[PDB]
Structure formats: C-alpha cells, structure tokens
Write an enzyme that holds these catalytic residues in place. Sequence first.
Site, PDB file in Angstrom:
ATOM      1  N   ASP A  80      -0.995  12.480  16.858  1.00 51.20           N
ATOM      2  CA  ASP A  80      -1.275  13.824  16.367  1.00 51.20           C
ATOM      3  C   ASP A  80      -2.394  13.870  15.337  1.00 51.20           C
ATOM      4  O   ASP A  80      -2.534  12.966  14.510  1.00 51.20           O
ATOM      5  CB  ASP A  80      -0.012  14.615  15.935  1.00 51.20           C
ATOM      6  CG  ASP A  80       0.657  14.057  14.687  1.00 51.20           C
ATOM      7  OD1 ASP A  80      -0.048  13.591  13.769  1.00 51.20           O
ATOM      8  OD2 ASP A  80       1.909  14.105  14.617  1.00 51.20           O
ATOM      9  N   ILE A 134       0.826  -1.192   0.000  1.00 54.43           N
ATOM     10  CA  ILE A 134       0.000   0.000   0.000  1.00 54.43           C
ATOM     11  C   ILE A 134       0.868   1.252   0.000  1.00 54.43           C
ATOM     12  O   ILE A 134       0.621   2.180  -0.756  1.00 54.43           O
ATOM     13  CB  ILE A 134      -0.865   0.062   1.256  1.00 54.43           C
ATOM     14  CG1 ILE A 134      -1.720  -1.188   1.398  1.00 54.43           C
ATOM     15  CG2 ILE A 134      -1.737   1.299   1.219  1.00 54.43           C
ATOM     16  CD1 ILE A 134      -2.579  -1.173   2.644  1.00 54.43           C
ATOM     17  N   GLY A 135       1.874   1.279   0.868  1.00 47.15           N
ATOM     18  CA  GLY A 135       2.770   2.418   0.964  1.00 47.15           C
ATOM     19  C   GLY A 135       4.200   2.031   1.289  1.00 47.15           C
ATOM     20  O   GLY A 135       4.458   0.970   1.856  1.00 47.15           O
ATOM     21  N   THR A 136       5.140   2.898   0.935  1.00 46.66           N
ATOM     22  CA  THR A 136       6.554   2.597   1.143  1.00 46.66           C
ATOM     23  C   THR A 136       7.286   3.739   1.828  1.00 46.66           C
ATOM     24  O   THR A 136       7.112   4.910   1.478  1.00 46.66           O
ATOM     25  CB  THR A 136       7.286   2.238  -0.179  1.00 46.66           C
ATOM     26  OG1 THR A 136       6.428   1.444  -1.006  1.00 46.66           O
ATOM     27  CG2 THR A 136       8.562   1.452   0.116  1.00 46.66           C
ATOM     28  N   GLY A 137       8.107   3.380   2.810  1.00 48.13           N
ATOM     29  CA  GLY A 137       8.874   4.342   3.576  1.00 48.13           C
ATOM     30  C   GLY A 137      10.175   4.756   2.906  1.00 48.13           C
ATOM     31  O   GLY A 137      10.430   4.321   1.774  1.00 48.13           O
ATOM     32  N   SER A 138      11.020   5.566   3.561  1.00 45.22           N
ATOM     33  CA  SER A 138      10.891   6.044   4.951  1.00 45.22           C
ATOM     34  C   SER A 138      10.875   4.910   5.990  1.00 45.22           C
ATOM     35  O   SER A 138      11.777   4.066   5.993  1.00 45.22           O
ATOM     36  CB  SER A 138       9.718   7.032   5.136  1.00 45.22           C
ATOM     37  OG  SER A 138      10.103   8.155   5.911  1.00 45.22           O
ATOM     38  N   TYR A 139       9.856   4.909   6.851  1.00 42.40           N
ATOM     39  CA  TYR A 139       9.634   3.875   7.872  1.00 42.40           C
ATOM     40  C   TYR A 139      10.056   2.477   7.420  1.00 42.40           C
ATOM     41  O   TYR A 139      10.809   1.786   8.107  1.00 42.40           O
ATOM     42  CB  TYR A 139       8.154   3.857   8.276  1.00 42.40           C
ATOM     43  CG  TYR A 139       7.199   3.777   7.095  1.00 42.40           C
ATOM     44  CD1 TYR A 139       6.827   4.925   6.396  1.00 42.40           C
ATOM     45  CD2 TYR A 139       6.666   2.555   6.677  1.00 42.40           C
ATOM     46  CE1 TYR A 139       5.959   4.859   5.309  1.00 42.40           C
ATOM     47  CE2 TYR A 139       5.800   2.477   5.589  1.00 42.40           C
ATOM     48  CZ  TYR A 139       5.450   3.634   4.910  1.00 42.40           C
ATOM     49  OH  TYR A 139       4.587   3.586   3.832  1.00 42.40           O
ATOM     50  N   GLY A 140       9.592   2.087   6.239  1.00 42.23           N
ATOM     51  CA  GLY A 140       9.772   0.744   5.732  1.00 42.23           C
ATOM     52  C   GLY A 140       8.740   0.486   4.655  1.00 42.23           C
ATOM     53  O   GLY A 140       8.840   1.019   3.553  1.00 42.23           O
ATOM     54  N   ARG A 141       7.727  -0.310   4.970  1.00 40.12           N
ATOM     55  CA  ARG A 141       6.742  -0.686   3.967  1.00 40.12           C
ATOM     56  C   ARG A 141       5.409  -1.092   4.587  1.00 40.12           C
ATOM     57  O   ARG A 141       5.354  -1.689   5.659  1.00 40.12           O
ATOM     58  CB  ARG A 141       7.297  -1.828   3.131  1.00 40.12           C
ATOM     59  CG  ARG A 141       6.615  -1.994   1.816  1.00 40.12           C
ATOM     60  CD  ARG A 141       7.535  -2.702   0.861  1.00 40.12           C
ATOM     61  NE  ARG A 141       7.943  -4.007   1.362  1.00 40.12           N
ATOM     62  CZ  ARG A 141       8.095  -5.074   0.586  1.00 40.12           C
ATOM     63  NH1 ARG A 141       7.860  -4.969  -0.715  1.00 40.12           N
ATOM     64  NH2 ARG A 141       8.468  -6.241   1.103  1.00 40.12           N
TER      65      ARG A 141
HETATM   66  C1  LIG Z   1       2.589   3.540   6.781  1.00 36.55           C
HETATM   67  C2  LIG Z   1       1.137   3.762   6.972  1.00 36.55           C
HETATM   68  C3  LIG Z   1       0.806   5.208   6.632  1.00 36.55           C
HETATM   69  C4  LIG Z   1       0.530   5.559   5.345  1.00 36.55           C
HETATM   70  C5  LIG Z   1       0.553   4.533   4.279  1.00 36.55           C
HETATM   71  F1  LIG Z   1      -0.376   3.592   4.541  1.00 36.55           F
HETATM   72  F2  LIG Z   1       0.284   5.107   3.092  1.00 36.55           F
HETATM   73  F3  LIG Z   1       1.760   3.966   4.234  1.00 36.55           F
HETATM   74  O1  LIG Z   1       0.794   3.457   8.283  1.00 36.55           O
HETATM   75  C6  LIG Z   1      -0.555   3.274   8.636  1.00 36.55           C
HETATM   76  C7  LIG Z   1      -1.423   2.688   7.724  1.00 36.55           C
HETATM   77  C8  LIG Z   1      -2.754   2.497   8.049  1.00 36.55           C
HETATM   78  C9  LIG Z   1      -3.710   1.843   7.022  1.00 36.55           C
HETATM   79  C10 LIG Z   1      -3.788   2.361   5.716  1.00 36.55           C
HETATM   80  C11 LIG Z   1      -4.670   1.747   4.790  1.00 36.55           C
HETATM   81  C12 LIG Z   1      -4.784   2.263   3.396  1.00 36.55           C
HETATM   82  C13 LIG Z   1      -5.663   1.795   2.370  1.00 36.55           C
HETATM   83  C14 LIG Z   1      -5.547   2.503   1.093  1.00 36.55           C
HETATM   84  C15 LIG Z   1      -6.394   2.166  -0.145  1.00 36.55           C
HETATM   85  N1  LIG Z   1      -6.895   0.792  -0.272  1.00 36.55           N
HETATM   86  C16 LIG Z   1      -8.087   0.773  -1.103  1.00 36.55           C
HETATM   87  C17 LIG Z   1      -5.844  -0.074  -0.892  1.00 36.55           C
HETATM   88  C18 LIG Z   1      -4.563   3.543   1.112  1.00 36.55           C
HETATM   89  S1  LIG Z   1      -3.885   3.545   2.690  1.00 36.55           S
HETATM   90  C19 LIG Z   1      -5.421   0.663   5.204  1.00 36.55           C
HETATM   91  N2  LIG Z   1      -5.324   0.188   6.466  1.00 36.55           N
HETATM   92  C20 LIG Z   1      -4.489   0.753   7.376  1.00 36.55           C
HETATM   93  N3  LIG Z   1      -4.433   0.207   8.687  1.00 36.55           N
HETATM   94  C21 LIG Z   1      -3.240   2.906   9.331  1.00 36.55           C
HETATM   95  C22 LIG Z   1      -2.377   3.492  10.245  1.00 36.55           C
HETATM   96  C23 LIG Z   1      -1.040   3.686   9.928  1.00 36.55           C
HETATM   97  C24 LIG Z   1      -0.118   4.322  10.929  1.00 36.55           C
HETATM   98  N4  LIG Z   1       1.066   5.070  10.498  1.00 36.55           N
HETATM   99  O2  LIG Z   1      -0.341   4.225  12.114  1.00 36.55           O
END
Ligand SMILES: C[C@H](/C=C\C(F)(F)F)Oc1cc(-c2cc(-c3cc(CN(C)C)cs3)cnc2N)ccc1C(N)=O
Length: 253
Positions: free
Chosen positions: A132, A12-19
Amino acid sequence: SRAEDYEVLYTIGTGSYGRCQKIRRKSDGKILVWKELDYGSMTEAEKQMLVSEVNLLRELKHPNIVRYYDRIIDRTNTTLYIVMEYCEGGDLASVITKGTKERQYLDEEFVLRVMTQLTLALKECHRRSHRDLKPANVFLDGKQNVKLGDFGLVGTPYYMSPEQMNRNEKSDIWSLGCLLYELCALMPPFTAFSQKELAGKIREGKFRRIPYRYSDELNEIITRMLNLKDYHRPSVEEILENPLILEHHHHHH
Ligand SMILES: C[C@H](/C=C\C(F)(F)F)Oc1cc(-c2cc(-c3cc(CN(C)C)cs3)cnc2N)ccc1C(N)=O
C-alpha cells in the site's frame, strides 16, 4: 544463513510486529537491517500464512521495491528474521512530519523523484498480478532512491479512493495522488475527524491547490490523479510520458 552471520548495531524501530534493527554482515561488513518476529505464540495456521507471505518477498526484485535478502529461523528463541536493505533516509512520514514541524516545503525535484519512482514501483506490482502507498511505507536510501516497503502485503483512512469507499489499478493512482499531495501541501488533500465526514469530503472531490512554489504542471498531474472518475485518472504510462519526468528522477545505482 544464521543470525551468527550478522551483528546487531542497534534498534531502529519496535513493534507491534516485533523489532527492527540495523545489522552488519560479518563476511563483508555490509550494512543491512532485519525485522524481528516472535512466532512462539502463533497457531500453525498463522505460521503457514507467515511462510506464505515470506515466500512472496523472495519473488520481487525491483530497484524501487525494498530489497529482501534473506530469512533466518531461530527455533531456540522462536524468532524469525527477515533481512533487507538499509534505507538510511528513513520513511516519508518522517520527512512530512519534519517539514510540518519546521515549516519547510520540500523541493519540487524531490517530489518528482517520489512521483517517478513510486509510479515505477506500481507498474511492477500491477504486472505481477498488494503493497500500500502511504508515507510510512515509503523509504529513502542514500542515493536519492525511493523504495516501497511491504506493509499491506483505528486511523482515519485518508487515502481511500472514492470507489473503494464503496464497492482496480486506478485506485492505486488515487492513493499515489494523495501521497504526492501530502508531500507538497504537508497535509492530506481531505481531512476530517470521523470517517463519515471524510467520505463526505472525498465524494465532493474538492481540495486546495498545492502551494504556489510548485508549478502548474506538477499540480495539474496531482489534480488528475485525484479525479473522482477512475477512468479520468492517468495510467502509469500516462504519468511517465509527462514532460516533468526526466532521466535524473529515476533510480540510480
Ligand atoms: C518495521 C519497519 C517499519 C518501520 C520502522 F523501521 F520504523 F520500524 O519495517 C521496514 C523497515 C525498513 C527500513 C527502515 C530504515 C530506517 C532508517 C532510519 C534512520 N537511520 C538513519 C537510522 C529510520 S527507519 C532503514 N532500512 C529499512 N529497510 C524498510 C521496510 C520496512 C517494511 N515494513 O517493509
């Protein structure tokens, strides 16, 4: 509690942090996500600190906080996995960007959702006393629920409160104010090119009304959250007593 219990669907996303990857629990096929961290290059200090933060996420259970599930260690690759719930609606930054791009304002109903559920998220944090309030740290699930992430637990600090701009729970109310504001107006209440310019504007305390498709009541309460005097900002309790907020704006299972 091993990585072999889960299957990676994709990143879904890539770090920085990691992945950050969407995953499937093999036992039952539950959709989750995990955050990848490579601790191979950390001192023992940073690793102790990291184990300290991880113990914190294991504490909070709340319907408006992104739910931790599990932590997985792979000493083979020196990789740490934090498993959490899937939030299919992604983050608020993207919703705001998307509305900015397609020039489409969000529904008041959706704003009230974020306002209501974030306020409850706050009240939970202040009790356990952190995280935050900024659009990138707010996540949406598939059931209209709004969830707060773990961030904070170069850029211009748009959401800096007047007080923290100098030397307090009401500071969080301000940030919440900035956030809902940005959600209505598709831009922060105060904008500038340098932080010093920014501080100049925040201290004057003037900004535009949010767009007229949003009611006076909605604008009144955001306005009150952006009050320069922290003691004039409403409490979490004052926010919830607002006639605007109804049962259907709360979390649902
Ligand atoms: C690293 C990530 C923060 C942003 C990133 F997701 F883009 F990397 O950490 C967390 C992620 C989540 C979280 C995000 C999502 C997402 C779903 C979508 C679109 N889908 C349709 C594929 C874009 S992002 C889904 N579930 C998640 N749990 C939540 C919290 C964090 C955090 N930094 O605490």
